[PDB]
């Protein structure tokens, strides 16, 4: 006849899980992010939390293809800088971005689809507008894929 | 450069065909997703979408349609259902690889997404081809007709086939209504019609009513185990129309078995079962009342034309008993009984 | 120079993960809860989320003992009714309890240590007090382990 | 029943010893935790706690103490540090098995938890046994003394040993302060003392000051790589006390090299380095001022007893230059220079 809820718990549990990762313990996956300029990186992490975070990951390890039980598989998207900042989000609900790399960070969110952490850049950039730098901005919005600022582009 | 786009497409076309071949085990998800992502990113979603429709259509027409057509006279439903599960399984992996197109391009160009496109090609090229359309309609209807006649049929094959017709309706029942529901209700109305002619031809009114309840229940249990829940109401109305509505005055006035007779022998339960059945249809209770008014008025004028008062109190008490115990103290029945009493008590 | 947070995310992510469990997919553990009266139960689940939830689990699969990589190991605590209600909490932050089994549920939270879901019973029971049934109540509080209601026992 | 409690304890005692033997691989966590849970649940936490202290003490005295005592003259720190890591590793698993006692019983009876008890038994029975206590103190101090003399030493063995003394302080530094910091500061004060006698005996005041800065920096870098951050302030004060405080008047008045001499040849930087060093200690700047007052007043009376005015402006400008560029426009120095000028300018 009862039924309870604890709002402090998804947060708390999520902390405990980060700590479980950062001890590089209990992980079921390891990612060799490798891109042209930068040297290859290995990130130990939990399959299940990655899927919680991104749909491109949910499907990666999913009923899908040869990433069924790999324990170790590559990613060749962007600098592993952004896969780190991203995983930081996927385990902490928070992401520290920079006045410079936010392009690469956002394009990251875009490629593996983290529409939350993408819309947070959508609203990240509105702040320090430049009529000087507006040009490249709109270039991103149309190139990016989501014409979501391309309209809001004044 | 466009020629590498052709190479991306060759990788994707080969991959899709390997998935359609169920050889997805050994395909790198990342490379197919990333390449599809790059194609859409450089605004080649239109080229990618056309290719997808071509490969999926090509696959379902040259292979799936023939496989289904070859099972027409030997375990048809098993193979068709097999083709449907294989289609859904392949399309999930295919929809995953083109997820980026699915979130940017299909949104911009008001076109159906990868999974719905897969359903449309399957619906139009397989389920509704023609020879297949007619054979699935005959089969499902033939099964319901055998079961109604007392035969035992595979209810699961029907549930899987009807569910398929529902999904192919694309969050609608258009496919299920046109291909299955409409002919099902037609042939059912005819079956219940010949059933009513026989039941009216032999059985008493009480037995007829019990067999109508039994038929109603039999069709509901059939809907719960074979058909779609949304078909419950239409089938019952057809059962209600053919067995009750079209014979309302016939049933209540059935010679030596009808309503007036039940009233004469105080068969309280039989009148209550009649009420329960006739309250389902419009003008059902109106017919019961017109029949009752004729009997109650006929009884009252003959009674008015210590024993006389006990006879009148037993007649009033009898019909008050009938009203509470059988007619659920119905507003219509209470007004009718009262109005009739107000007619013959005022006459002299 | 920026830094964002999304409070809706621990919740949302946690839903996605439940759904990943209930599909009995991506799981790294399977529990054969087995107790005297009841027949043995198998629960597929994620090691990492169980640890997020309970410390007795964090340590179970931990650097500790032979539960290092088992994929399948028993538990002989209470009826698997409560391990189900509990896992429901561990994946949803919510637990539907009953006017009857709440003893067994709470003793569950107690044994694997879920002090949140234990204090929620601590306050569960205060509601329908019986001066008739108060006796057994205090018997629980002293037997239980935590003399946390034993004082509040009026 | 109590006899099965004895069986639970036998299972736990055997398990703990297998963990101490590092044979934890093959121990069912659940059974040891659940049994420990059941023991505490039936209020036998006192019996379980006593047993734990007995087995842990028994293990560290009969095995660990002897192993450490046997390495006294052959790679002592490596084995002691090895015993400490093995102790911490075993105690984690042991603290996990008795988690239920750790949350109910130790809370009720104001006793140290399983992990702290493990630290206490290790601290008292090993680190502070006696022969071990003295040998670890001599070794660490011997290493710092060799490094200060120019030898190269294993800084990591010191960092691991000092960290251990810190932890065994039980979220305090009592163990580290008594066993290490106190004797370290003692022997350091003596080393810096003999170092000052030599430096004062040969080198100029400028060279002495540069060597004091170099010694201060050398000890800080040593604290960052070997000792505990909380030792930074005490060691610098000892360096400051033995090299500066105790020789304040000696340094400024060093014949043909001191403050007045730097003032005579306008060695601006040397005076600034002296200020930087003397501002660290109490009464440092007071000594510099008393020395300056004596020189500035002596210069001013001889000057007052176009060339006379340019001589006085160059002397005022010279000391204003000294105040801004060397004395950081110090409040004390500005008041002193002004007060001295107010004395000799008012005399005649």
Numbering used by the authors:
A (entry chain A), C (entry chain A): 51 to 204
B (entry chain B), D (entry chain B): 26 to 330, 339 to 381
Task: Copy the relevant paper text.
KEAP1 promotes the ubiquitin-dependent degradation of NRF2 by assembling into a CUL3-dependent ubiquitin ligase complex.
To date there are no structures of the KEAP1-CUL3 interaction nor binding data to show the contributions of different domains to their binding affinity. We determined a crystal structure of the BTB and 3-box domains of human KEAP1 in complex with the CUL3 N-terminal domain that showed a heterotetrameric assembly with 2:2 stoichiometry. To support the structural data, we developed a versatile TR-FRET-based assay system to profile the binding of BTB-domain-containing proteins to CUL3 and determine the contribution of distinct protein features, revealing the importance of the CUL3 N-terminal extension for high affinity binding. We further provide direct evidence that the investigational drug CDDO does not disrupt the KEAP1-CUL3 interaction, even at high concentrations, but reduces the affinity of KEAP1-CUL3 binding.
